[PDB]
Amino acid sequence: MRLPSADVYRFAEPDSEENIIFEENMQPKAGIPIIKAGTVIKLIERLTYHMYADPNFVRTFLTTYRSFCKPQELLSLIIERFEIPEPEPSAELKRFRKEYIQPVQLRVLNVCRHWVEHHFYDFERDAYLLQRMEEFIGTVRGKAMKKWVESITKIIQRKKIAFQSSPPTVEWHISRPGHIETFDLLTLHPIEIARQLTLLESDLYRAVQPSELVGSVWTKEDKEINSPNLLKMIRHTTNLTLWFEKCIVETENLEERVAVVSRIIEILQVFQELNNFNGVLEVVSAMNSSPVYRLDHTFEQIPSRQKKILEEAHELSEDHYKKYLAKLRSINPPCVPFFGIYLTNILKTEEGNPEVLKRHGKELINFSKRRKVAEITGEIQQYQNQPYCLRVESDIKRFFENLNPMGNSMEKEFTDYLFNKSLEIEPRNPKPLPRFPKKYSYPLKSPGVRPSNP
Amino acid sequence: HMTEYKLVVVGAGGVGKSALTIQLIQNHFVDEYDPTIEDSYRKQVVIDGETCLLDILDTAGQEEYSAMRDQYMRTGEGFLCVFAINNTKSFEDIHQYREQIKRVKDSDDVPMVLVGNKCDLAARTVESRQAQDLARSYGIPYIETSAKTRQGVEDAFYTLVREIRQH
Numbered sequence: 001m002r003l004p005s006a007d008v009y010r011f012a013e014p015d016s017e018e019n020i021i022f023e024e025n026m027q028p029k030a031g032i033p034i035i036k037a038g039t040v041i042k043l044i045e046r047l048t049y050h051m052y053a054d055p056n057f058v059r060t061f062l063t064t065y066r067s068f069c070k071p072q073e074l075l076s077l078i079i080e081r082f083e084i085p086e087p088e089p090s091a092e093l094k095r096f097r098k099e100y101i102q103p104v105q106l107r108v109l110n111v112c113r114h115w116v117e118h119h120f121y122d123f124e125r126d127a128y129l130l131q132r133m134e135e136f137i138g139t140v141r142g143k144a145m146k147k148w149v150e151s152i153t154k155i156i157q158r159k160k161i162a163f164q165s166s167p168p169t170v171e172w173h174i175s176r177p178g179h180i181e182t183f184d185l186l187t188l189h190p191i192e193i194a195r196q197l198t199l200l201e202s203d204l205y206r207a208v209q210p211s212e213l214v215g216s217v218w219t220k221e222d223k224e225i226n227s228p229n230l231l232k233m234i235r236h237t238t239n240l241t242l243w244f245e246k247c248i249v250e251t252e253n254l255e256e257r258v259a260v261v262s263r264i265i266e267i268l269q270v271f272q273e274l275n276n277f278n279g280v281l282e283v284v285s286a287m288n289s290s291p292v293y294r295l296d297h298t299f300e301q302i303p304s305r306q307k308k309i310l311e312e313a314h315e316l317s318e319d320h321y322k323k324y325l326a327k328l329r330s331i332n333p334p335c336v337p338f339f340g341i342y343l344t345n346i347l348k349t350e351e352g353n354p355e356v357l358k359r360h361g362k363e364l365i366n367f368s369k370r371r372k373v374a375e376i377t378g379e380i381q382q383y384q385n386q387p388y389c390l391r392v393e394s395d396i397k398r399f400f401e402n403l404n405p406m407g408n409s410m411e412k413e414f415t416d417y418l419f420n421k422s423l424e425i426e427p428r429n430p431k432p433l434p435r436f437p438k439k440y441s442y443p444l445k446s447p448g449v450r451p452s453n454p
Numbered sequence: 455h456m457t458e459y460k461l462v463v464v465g466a467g468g469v470g471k472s473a474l475t476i477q478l479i480q481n482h483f484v485d486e487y488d489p490t491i492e493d494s495y496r497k498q499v500v501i502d503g504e505t506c507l508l509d510i511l512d513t514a515g516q517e518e519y520s521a522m523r524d525q526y527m528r529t530g531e532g533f534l535c536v537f538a539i540n541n542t543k544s545f546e547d548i549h550q551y552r553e554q555i556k557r558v559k560d561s562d563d564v565p566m567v568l569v570g571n572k573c574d575l576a577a578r579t580v581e582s583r584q585a586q587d588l589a590r591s592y593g594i595p596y597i598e599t600s601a602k603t604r605q606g607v608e609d610a611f612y613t614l615v616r617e618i619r620q621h
């Protein structure tokens with residue numbers, strides 16, 4: 001083909017080592033080359049390539065472009081890409097319109113459609129970006145494009161306006177339905193504590209979007225603005241670990257404290273069965289905390305079966321989460337992954353690889369780095385699709401959402417309170433073990449973790 | 455078997471702490487890191503003629519999981535306490551990181567190094583003398599590193615291994 005000159009159309013400049021480089025392998029299922037780096041003009045040309053569609057590149061590009069190109073600049077470049085001039089002067093003009101103009105223009109609309117559908121937050125955050133998108137889509141003329149132009153207008157307008165068999169029966173122990181004032185660790189049913197926390201944690205996990213992760217924004221000074229769902233998910237986790245520690249060390253009577261620790265390990269067992277790894281690690285973090293880890297008189301009295309359950313759970317995190325990773329890979333949804341691993345991998349990928357590659361003195365955007373980030377965000381998304389077949393108990397949910405073990409205390413003051421409580425209830429050797437009065441008027445016997453009805 | 459040292463990097467988030475271990479593990483000359491593999495955190499080194507393997511844990515990005523730290527503090531043999539020389543709050547946060555480690559280890563003598571990291575071109579707010587005074591009050595070495603040039607990186611990790619060896 002005879003494409004126009006570079007002086008009249010920037011995207012016609014031929015490929016070279018100075019403007020585009022590739023990885024050695026092809027896209028597994030498509031047989032398409034993998035772009036390693038390129039100028040933004042070459043990345044835009046390949047985003048809307050005439051020879052073939054490239055959905056993996058489009059998805060990756062739209063998830064990660066904001067580190068090297070502003071949304072306002074992207075819209076300009078795809079509008080410039082759509083305005084293809086005819087070459088300086090038939091058989092040539094008829095094939096150019098059908099094999100270059102029509103496919104490129106259609107790929108631009110596919111980018112616009114995917115942008116408005118999966119990354120609408122760019123438009124929500126910048127009303128002028130949406131104005132320019134609506135203008136440009138209004139200028140598109142052709143029966144070929146009409147169908148795709150109408151689809152984009154429907155997504156825009158919808159974005160502006162904004163399934164199983166029966167779940168198991170809800171489990172009740174000492175506290176009865178509606179007696180919210182008596183809800184506590186030992187009075188609620190251990191099966192139901194685990195189910196409701198798994199539902200809460202599953203929803204917190206599912207609400208985290210790639211916009212909260214790309215660019216490591218949860219670690220930057222605007223984290224509360226840019227990563228609110230992620231930070232709500234982390235804060236719930238931390239809060240539940242502190243609540244378990246607080247339940248333990250504030251139970252001063254040894255026999256009651258043994259019943260408390262034992263009940264938490266039963267909650268852990270149900271979490272393991274539900275594949276709620278976040279919940280498993282909430283419990284493990286509480287058992288491994290300074291105040292709890294040192295309670296030798298409490299752990300001595302724990303039945304062997306529960307010690308082994310806790311020990312296998314503790315092993316999941318050892319050796320850089322080796323067993324946890326193997327296990328998450330071996331299971332199928334529904335599950336609640338531990339988010340922390342992804343956070344470190346995204347951050348270390350972004351900080352350990354350069355933003356730009358240089359070839360013959362020219363700067364190329366390192367796209368492969370961005371692809372690695374998009375692969376981690378894609379893995380996160382794979383686990384957010386499948387919900388749990390468990391019914392919500394509104395009052396238990398509200399009980400766990402409103403837990404606040406720290407109260408008005410700051411972090412240091414509170415963890416110092418937990419540790420000093422631990423020292424009081426089980427003094428360091430050679431101080432003798434004191435006795436403390438019982439605080440629970442109801443029975444300490446657990447109903448177990450086997451469902452009570454068919 | 456050669457000795458294995460379990461090292462732990464602790465410090466404030468948002469100030470480039472991850473560059474320390476990334477630079478150690480990268481050979482220099484190669485700028486292509488994958489944190490998903492063993493070789494990204496395990497490194498065979500030779501320190502004072504003695505070969506060893508450094509198993510480095512750096513949970514950079516997980517600082518909000520503030521109730522999950524006691525585990526690695528208990529298992530870690532030596533700690534790199536990292537602050538950014540352009541961020542005073544990260545320097546002021548060291549005291550509590552060291553207090554937690556001491557509590558978890560149940561000891562006032564834990565192998566530890568204070569690391570001042572020059573993570574970008576922005577202005578220095580923590581002078582080397584303040585950091586040297588803090589390190590001396592704790593009885594630990596102080597090492598300044600650059601995230602751009604790799605200067606001091608080797609010295610920070612090797613000094614920590616010497617503190618473990620001499621414990």
Ligand SMILES: Nc1ccc(S(=O)(=O)N2CCCCC2=O)cc1
Nearest residue numbers: 318319320460461509510511529
């Ligand atoms: N350097 C190092 C320090 C600690 C460990 S761990 O097995 O305690 N652990 C527990 C915390 C989460 C990851 C981990 O690996 C291993 C290597």
